[PDB]
Coordinates of all heavy atoms in Angstrom, one line a residue:
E116 N -13.1 31.5 30.6 CA -13.5 30.5 31.5 C -14.2 29.4 30.8 O -13.9 28.2 31.1 CB -14.4 31.1 32.6 CG -13.7 32.2 33.5 CD -14.7 32.8 34.4 OE1 -15.8 33.1 34.0 OE2 -14.3 33.1 35.6
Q117 N -15.1 29.7 29.9 CA -15.8 28.7 29.1 C -14.9 27.8 28.3 O -15.0 26.6 28.3 CB -16.9 29.3 28.3 CG -17.7 28.4 27.3 CD -18.2 29.1 26.1 OE1 -17.7 29.1 25.0 NE2 -19.3 29.8 26.4
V118 N -14.0 28.5 27.6 CA -13.1 27.7 26.6 C -12.2 26.8 27.4 O -11.9 25.7 26.9 CB -12.3 28.7 25.8 CG1 -11.3 29.4 26.6 CG2 -11.7 27.9 24.6
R119 N -11.7 27.2 28.6 CA -10.8 26.3 29.3 C -11.6 25.1 29.8 O -11.0 24.0 29.8 CB -10.3 27.1 30.6 CG -9.0 26.6 31.1 CD -8.7 27.0 32.5 NE -8.6 28.5 32.6 CZ -9.5 29.3 33.0 NH1 -10.7 28.9 33.4 NH2 -9.3 30.6 33.0
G120 N -12.8 25.2 30.2 CA -13.6 24.0 30.5 C -13.6 23.0 29.4 O -13.5 21.8 29.7
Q121 N -13.8 23.4 28.2 CA -13.7 22.5 27.0 C -12.5 21.7 27.0 O -12.4 20.5 26.8 CB -14.0 23.3 25.7 CG -15.5 23.5 25.4 CD -15.7 24.3 24.1 OE1 -14.9 24.1 23.2 NE2 -16.7 25.2 24.2
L122 N -11.3 22.5 27.1 CA -10.0 21.8 27.0 C -9.8 20.8 28.2 O -9.4 19.7 28.0 CB -8.9 22.9 27.1 CG -7.5 22.3 27.2 CD1 -7.2 21.3 26.1 CD2 -6.5 23.5 27.1
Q123 N -10.3 21.2 29.4 CA -10.1 20.3 30.5 C -10.9 19.0 30.3 O -10.4 17.9 30.6 CB -10.5 21.0 31.8 CG -9.9 20.4 33.1 CD -8.5 20.0 33.0 OE1 -8.1 18.9 32.5 NE2 -7.6 20.9 33.3
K124 N -12.1 19.1 29.9 CA -13.0 18.0 29.6 C -12.4 17.1 28.5 O -12.4 15.9 28.6 CB -14.4 18.4 29.4 CG -15.2 17.3 28.7 CD -16.7 17.6 28.8 CE -17.1 19.0 28.2 NZ -16.9 19.0 26.7
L125 N -12.0 17.8 27.4 CA -11.4 17.0 26.3 C -10.1 16.3 26.6 O -9.9 15.2 26.2 CB -11.3 18.0 25.1 CG -12.6 18.5 24.5 CD1 -12.3 19.8 23.8 CD2 -13.2 17.5 23.7
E126 N -9.3 17.0 27.4 CA -8.0 16.4 27.7 C -8.1 15.2 28.5 O -7.4 14.2 28.2 CB -7.1 17.4 28.5 CG -5.7 17.0 28.7 CD -4.9 18.1 29.4 OE1 -5.4 18.7 30.4 OE2 -3.7 18.3 29.0
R127 N -9.0 15.1 29.4 CA -9.3 13.9 30.2 C -9.8 12.8 29.3 O -9.4 11.6 29.4 CB -10.4 14.2 31.3 CG -10.8 12.9 32.1 CD -11.8 13.2 33.1 NE -11.3 14.1 34.2 CZ -11.4 15.4 34.2 NH1 -11.9 16.1 33.1 NH2 -10.9 16.1 35.2
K128 N -10.6 13.1 28.3 CA -11.1 12.1 27.4 C -10.0 11.5 26.5 O -10.2 10.4 26.0 CB -12.2 12.7 26.5 CG -12.9 11.7 25.5 CD -14.4 11.8 25.5 CE -14.9 13.0 24.8 NZ -16.3 13.2 25.0
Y129 N -9.0 12.2 26.3 CA -7.9 11.7 25.4 C -7.1 10.6 26.1 O -7.1 9.5 25.6 CB -6.9 12.9 25.1 CG -5.7 12.4 24.4 CD1 -5.8 11.5 23.3 CD2 -4.4 12.8 24.7 CE1 -4.7 11.1 22.6 CE2 -3.3 12.4 24.1 CZ -3.5 11.5 23.0 OH -2.3 11.1 22.3
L130 N -6.6 10.8 27.3 CA -5.8 9.8 28.0 C -6.7 8.6 28.3 O -6.2 7.4 28.3 CB -5.2 10.3 29.2 CG -6.1 11.0 30.3 CD1 -6.6 9.9 31.2 CD2 -5.4 12.1 31.0
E131 N -8.0 8.8 28.5 CA -8.9 7.7 28.7 C -9.0 6.8 27.4 O -9.0 5.6 27.5 CB -10.3 8.3 29.1 CG -11.3 7.2 29.6 CD -12.4 7.8 30.4 OE1 -12.1 8.2 31.6 OE2 -13.5 7.8 30.0
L132 N -9.1 7.5 26.3 CA -9.1 6.7 25.0 C -7.8 6.0 24.8 O -7.7 4.9 24.4 CB -9.3 7.7 23.8 CG -10.7 7.6 23.2 CD1 -10.9 6.3 22.5 CD2 -11.8 7.8 24.2
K133 N -6.6 6.6 25.2 CA -5.3 6.0 25.0 C -5.2 4.7 25.8 O -4.7 3.7 25.3 CB -4.2 7.0 25.4 CG -2.8 6.4 25.3 CD -2.5 5.9 23.9 CE -1.1 6.1 23.5 NZ -0.6 7.5 23.6
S134 N -5.7 4.7 27.0 CA -5.6 3.5 27.8 C -6.3 2.4 27.2 O -5.8 1.2 27.2 CB -6.1 3.8 29.3 OG -6.0 2.6 30.0
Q135 N -7.5 2.6 26.7 CA -8.4 1.5 26.2 C -7.7 1.0 24.9 O -7.9 -0.2 24.6 CB -9.7 2.1 25.8 CG -10.6 2.4 27.1 CD -12.0 2.6 26.8 OE1 -12.6 2.0 25.8 NE2 -12.7 3.4 27.6
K136 N -6.9 1.8 24.2 CA -6.4 1.3 22.9 C -5.4 0.1 23.1 O -5.5 -0.9 22.4 CB -5.6 2.4 22.2 CG -4.8 2.0 21.0 CD -4.3 3.2 20.2 CE -3.2 3.9 21.0 NZ -2.0 3.1 21.3
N137 N -4.6 0.2 24.1 CA -3.7 -0.9 24.4 C -4.4 -2.2 24.8 O -4.1 -3.3 24.4 CB -2.7 -0.6 25.5 CG -1.4 0.0 24.9 OD1 -0.7 -0.6 24.2 ND2 -1.1 1.3 25.3
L138 N -5.5 -2.0 25.6 CA -6.2 -3.2 26.1 C -6.9 -3.9 25.0 O -6.8 -5.2 24.9 CB -7.2 -2.7 27.1 CG -8.2 -3.8 27.6 CD1 -7.5 -5.0 28.2 CD2 -9.1 -3.2 28.7
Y139 N -7.5 -3.2 24.1 CA -8.2 -3.9 23.0 C -7.1 -4.5 22.0 O -7.3 -5.6 21.5 CB -9.1 -2.9 22.2 CG -10.4 -2.8 22.8 CD1 -10.7 -1.9 23.8 CD2 -11.5 -3.7 22.4 CE1 -12.0 -1.7 24.3 CE2 -12.7 -3.6 23.0 CZ -13.0 -2.6 23.9 OH -14.2 -2.5 24.5
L140 N -6.0 -3.8 21.8 CA -5.0 -4.4 20.9 C -4.4 -5.6 21.6 O -4.1 -6.6 20.9 CB -3.9 -3.3 20.7 CG -4.2 -2.2 19.7 CD1 -3.3 -1.1 19.9 CD2 -4.2 -2.8 18.3
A141 N -4.2 -5.6 22.9 CA -3.6 -6.7 23.6 C -4.5 -7.9 23.5 O -4.0 -9.1 23.2 CB -3.4 -6.4 25.1
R142 N -5.8 -7.7 23.7 CA -6.8 -8.8 23.5 C -6.8 -9.4 22.1 O -7.1 -10.6 21.9 CB -8.1 -8.4 24.0 CG -8.3 -8.3 25.5 CD -9.5 -7.5 25.8 NE -10.8 -8.2 25.6 CZ -11.9 -7.7 25.1 NH1 -12.0 -6.4 24.9 NH2 -13.0 -8.5 24.9
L143 N -6.5 -8.5 21.1 CA -6.5 -8.9 19.7 C -5.4 -9.9 19.4 O -5.5 -10.9 18.8 CB -6.4 -7.7 18.8 CG -6.2 -8.0 17.3 CD1 -7.4 -8.8 16.8 CD2 -6.1 -6.7 16.5
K144 N -4.1 -9.5 19.9 CA -3.0 -10.4 19.7 C -3.2 -11.7 20.4 O -2.9 -12.8 19.9 CB -1.7 -9.7 20.1 CG -1.3 -8.6 19.2 CD -0.4 -7.6 19.9 CE -0.2 -6.3 19.1 NZ 0.5 -5.3 19.9
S145 N -3.7 -11.7 21.6 CA -4.0 -12.9 22.4 C -5.1 -13.6 21.6 O -5.1 -14.9 21.5 CB -4.4 -12.6 23.8 OG -4.7 -13.8 24.5
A146 N -6.1 -12.9 21.1 CA -7.1 -13.5 20.3 C -6.7 -13.9 18.9 O -7.5 -14.4 18.1 CB -8.3 -12.5 20.2
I147 N -5.4 -13.6 18.6 CA -4.8 -14.1 17.3 C -3.7 -15.1 17.5 O -3.6 -16.0 16.8 CB -4.3 -12.8 16.5 CG1 -5.4 -12.3 15.6 CG2 -3.1 -13.2 15.6 CD1 -5.7 -13.2 14.4
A148 N -2.8 -14.8 18.5 CA -1.7 -15.7 18.8 C -2.2 -17.0 19.4 O -2.0 -18.1 18.7 CB -0.7 -15.0 19.8
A149 N -2.9 -17.0 20.5 CA -3.5 -18.2 21.0 C -4.5 -18.8 20.0 O -4.9 -19.9 20.0 CB -4.2 -17.9 22.3
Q150 N -5.0 -17.9 19.1 CA -6.0 -18.3 18.0 C -5.2 -19.0 16.9 O -5.7 -20.0 16.4 CB -6.6 -17.0 17.5 CG -6.8 -16.8 16.0 CD -7.5 -18.0 15.3 OE1 -8.1 -18.8 16.0 NE2 -7.3 -18.1 14.0
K151 N -4.0 -18.6 16.5 CA -3.4 -19.2 15.3 C -2.7 -20.5 15.6 O -2.2 -21.1 14.6 CB -2.4 -18.2 14.8 CG -2.1 -18.3 13.3 CD -0.8 -17.5 12.9 CE 0.2 -18.5 12.3 NZ 1.5 -17.9 12.1
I152 N -2.7 -21.0 16.8 CA -2.0 -22.2 17.1 C -3.0 -23.4 16.9 O -2.6 -24.4 16.3 CB -1.4 -22.3 18.5 CG1 -2.4 -21.8 19.5 CG2 -0.2 -21.4 18.6 CD1 -2.0 -22.0 21.0
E153 N -4.2 -23.3 17.4 CA -5.1 -24.5 17.4 C -5.4 -25.0 16.0 O -5.7 -26.2 15.9 CB -6.4 -24.1 18.1 CG -7.0 -25.2 18.9 CD -6.3 -25.5 20.2 OE1 -5.2 -24.9 20.4 OE2 -6.8 -26.3 21.0
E154 N -5.3 -24.2 15.0 CA -5.5 -24.7 13.6 C -4.4 -25.7 13.2 O -4.7 -26.7 12.6 CB -5.7 -23.6 12.7 CG -5.7 -23.9 11.2 CD -5.1 -22.9 10.3 OE1 -5.5 -21.7 10.4 OE2 -4.3 -23.2 9.4
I155 N -3.2 -25.3 13.4 CA -2.1 -26.2 13.0 C -2.1 -27.5 13.8 O -1.7 -28.5 13.3 CB -0.7 -25.5 13.2 CG1 -0.1 -25.6 14.6 CG2 -0.9 -24.0 12.8 CD1 1.3 -25.0 14.7
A156 N -2.6 -27.5 15.1 CA -2.9 -28.7 15.8 C -4.0 -29.4 15.1 O -4.1 -30.6 15.3 CB -3.3 -28.3 17.2
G157 N -4.9 -28.8 14.4 CA -5.8 -29.5 13.6 C -5.2 -30.4 12.5 O -5.7 -31.5 12.3
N158 N -4.1 -29.9 11.9 CA -3.4 -30.8 11.0 C -2.7 -31.9 11.8 O -2.3 -32.9 11.1 CB -2.3 -29.9 10.3 CG -2.9 -28.7 9.6 OD1 -3.0 -27.6 10.2 ND2 -3.2 -28.8 8.3
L159 N -2.5 -31.8 13.1 CA -2.0 -32.9 13.9 C -3.2 -33.3 14.9 O -2.9 -33.5 16.0 CB -0.8 -32.4 14.7 CG 0.5 -32.3 13.9 CD1 0.4 -31.4 12.7 CD2 1.6 -31.8 14.8
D160 N -4.4 -33.3 14.3 CA -5.6 -33.4 15.2 C -5.4 -34.6 16.2 O -5.7 -34.4 17.4 CB -6.8 -33.6 14.4 CG -8.0 -32.9 14.9 OD1 -7.8 -31.7 15.4 OD2 -9.1 -33.4 14.8
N161 N -5.1 -35.8 15.7 CA -5.1 -37.0 16.5 C -6.5 -37.3 16.9 O -6.6 -38.1 17.9 CB -4.1 -36.8 17.7 CG -3.7 -38.2 18.3 OD1 -4.3 -39.2 18.0 ND2 -2.6 -38.1 19.1
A162 N -7.5 -36.8 16.3 CA -8.9 -37.1 16.6 C -9.7 -37.4 15.4 O -10.9 -37.8 15.5 CB -9.5 -35.9 17.3
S163 N -9.1 -37.3 14.2 CA -9.9 -37.7 12.9 C -8.9 -38.4 12.0 O -7.8 -38.8 12.4 CB -10.4 -36.4 12.3 OG -9.4 -35.7 11.6

């Protein structure tokens, strides 16, 4: 009975971790893709 409780609690923690992985990765690419454009517009600044 005790050992099963450990597995049940741990199993829930796994899929919970899995969901967060995509979200942070997604924000990273957005924080890199939308990030990597503005610099090249700096070479076309039209402001300096």
Side-chain angles (χ1 to χ4, degrees):
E116 297 176 320
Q117 172 205 104
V118 69
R119 204 195 300 101
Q121 275 178 38
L122 173 55
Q123 202 41 275
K124 163 163 58 65
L125 293 159
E126 190 177 40
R127 177 183 291 91
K128 180 132 78 193
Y129 172 46
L130 57 89
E131 192 157 291
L132 254 292
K133 176 56 149 302
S134 177
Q135 292 192 28
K136 171 169 69 61
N137 268 300
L138 173 54
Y139 276 91
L140 285 164
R142 286 165 70 217
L143 172 61
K144 288 157 193 172
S145 182
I147 272 283
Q150 136 54 18
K151 208 196 119 189
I152 45 168
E153 213 73 354
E154 172 211 310
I155 87 175
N158 308 85
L159 287 54
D160 218 40
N161 203 339
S163 79

